[PDB]
């Protein structure tokens, strides 16, 4: 079910995964047309929609430095750690929201980015270079 | 068409007295007054 933009904010993470393109398509293009030339009021909203694309490109750089690159669902090779949210499957995807999920991960979220940027492409690329000659 | 989409099962904590939209609208109204009165007729010689 669609339910439009952010419709599954309180639904399960599994049901919320069914609407990734919906949340993705409405964040980048909130296009205001600034054809009228008004002096001091344009710089504020221009800075706003420029910092918007700066944050978007920061997220895209983070999603490119990883083995994942497709702006979609993707799998990695970094194992999940039992210290992070000691929960089984179906307990997460059927009785939890992405908000509470990021809240519980926020304690251990900072090292996961490092494990994804270094334990992967800093070694996966090097293995790709030393295993593509044969 | 105003895209008004109700989010079911969503309860969100609002606080109107710490909101920042009010500050934005206040500064915008102030700059509106200032930029509306800038190119008009000044009356400094009227102080007689």
């Amino acid at each position, epitope marked *: 079910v669609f339910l439009g933009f952010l419709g599954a904010a309180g639904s*399960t993470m599994g*049901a919320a995964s069914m609407t990734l393109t919906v949340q993705a398509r409405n964040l980048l293009s909130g296009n205001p047309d600034w054809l009228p030339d008004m002096t001091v009021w344009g710089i504020k909203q221009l800075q706003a929609r420029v910092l918007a694309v700066e944050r978007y490109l920061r997220d895209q750089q983070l999603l490119g430095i990883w083995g994942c690159s497709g702006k979609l669902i993707c799998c990695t090779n970094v194992p999940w750690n039992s210290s992070w949210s000691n929960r089984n499957l*179906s307990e997460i995807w*059927d*009785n939890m929201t992405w908000l509470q999920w990021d809240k519980e991960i926020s304690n251990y979220t900072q090292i996961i980015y490092g494990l994804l940027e270094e334990s992967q492409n800093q070694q996966e690329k090097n293995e790709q270079d030393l295993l593509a000659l044969d | 068409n105003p895209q008004e989409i109700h989010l079911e099962n969503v309860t969100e*904590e609002f606080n109107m007295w710490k909101n920042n939209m009010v500050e934005q609208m206040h500064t915008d109204i102030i700059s509106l007054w200032d930029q509306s009165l800038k190119p008009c007729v000044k009356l400094t010689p009227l102080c007689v």
Partner: nanobody
Framework: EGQLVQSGAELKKPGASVKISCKTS????????INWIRQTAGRGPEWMGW????????????????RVIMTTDTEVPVTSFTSTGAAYMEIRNLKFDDTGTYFC????????????????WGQGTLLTVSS
């Protein structure tokens, strides 16, 4: 952190009726089904029925289709994740076989094959049908 509280102990006569409350706290009342199951020494435990505070969908046992009526109020949100609802149950045509401890409990999951399964149980409420 859902800490549910049921009603108090009451005494009734056969053929009369009695109403048992089921006040909740610490969790979203509309996010889970509310089960109701009894425990009588004459036939052991028997699942009485569940109800959905969100969609308003109830489901009883065919033996309790006529005498059990389960109602729910609307949840009172305390925080963005906490609400204090209430689930009442009225039982009529009291007989000698309906003497025991009754329970209401919280549903398991919000989606899947076992969504309504009782996880968090109340402390219980004992009823004695006697003249």
């Amino acid at each position: 952190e859902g800490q549910l509280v049921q009603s108090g102990a009451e005494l009734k006569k056969p053929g009369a009726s009695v109403k048992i409350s089921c006040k909740t706290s610490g969790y979203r009342f509309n996010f889970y089904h509310i089960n109701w199951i009894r425990q009588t020494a004459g036939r052991g435990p028997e699942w009485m029925g569940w109800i959905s505070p969100y969609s308003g969908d109830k489901n009883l046992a065919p033996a309790f289709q006529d005498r059990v009526i389960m109602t729910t109020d609307t949840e009172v949100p305390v925080t963005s994740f906490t609400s204090t609802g209430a689930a009442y149950m009225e039982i009529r045509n009291l007989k000698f076989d309906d003497t025991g401890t009754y329970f209401c409990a919280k549903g398991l999951l919000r989606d899947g094959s076992s969504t309504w399964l009782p996880y968090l149980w109340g402390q219980g409420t004992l009823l004695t049908v006697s003249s």
